[PDB]
């Protein structure tokens, strides 16, 4: 789901 991409992005850029 393309709509989930930014959430993963947000998570991996915190750490």
């Amino acid at each position, epitope marked *: 789901n393309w709509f989930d991409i930014t*959430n993963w*992005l947000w998570y991996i850029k915190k750490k």
Partner: antibody
Amino acid sequence: VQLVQSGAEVKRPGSSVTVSCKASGGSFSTYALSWVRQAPGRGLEWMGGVIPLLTITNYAPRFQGRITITADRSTSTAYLELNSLRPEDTAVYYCAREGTTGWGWLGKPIGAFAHWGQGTLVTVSS
Amino acid sequence: EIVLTQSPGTQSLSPGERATLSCRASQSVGNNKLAWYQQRPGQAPRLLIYGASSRPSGVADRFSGSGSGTDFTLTISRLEPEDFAVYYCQQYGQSLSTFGQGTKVEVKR
């Protein structure tokens, strides 16, 4: 976050239109920007979107082959291009960016469209 | 392609009444990614509910969302004058996002 779109435009049948959407506030690069249109008196139709950092576009099958969505991170501007225009493409075109949770505008993205441009009326006519 | 059905397409109600608006999906909506928007004439739509039941801050708590799977509901506990408007559901649980055709809530007289 505010989205500001280019002004109304008259286009000839068969031409291509480009509509822009300048974001200010929050992060441009890591949030999903979509385009949604509404023909006069009709419903909202999602056309497609782009995640600029990744240059990953996602187009509705109905527009795949007629549409290009791009993002210029140097100006926080997103573009919709739509080709081979016909009377039925007469509509208000909105850009919209996903919302975020919590305080500020750098929170976790919610997918759904919290932030809308003012819309751009494109009239296809001779 | 997920078809969202908003039926009825119009509801005639009086100020102060309750409203419940239906959105039925042709297939299960992935992770309940179902949003609701309000649109008044001449205005851009405004997000009311996301993830079936989450409400942005800023949105009046008389709006609530419920449901999962294929069966979703927007509830307006008590209609204020400004709530008479068009409401659209939207699924974004697949890369192909779709909207319902909208339900207009209008004033019965």
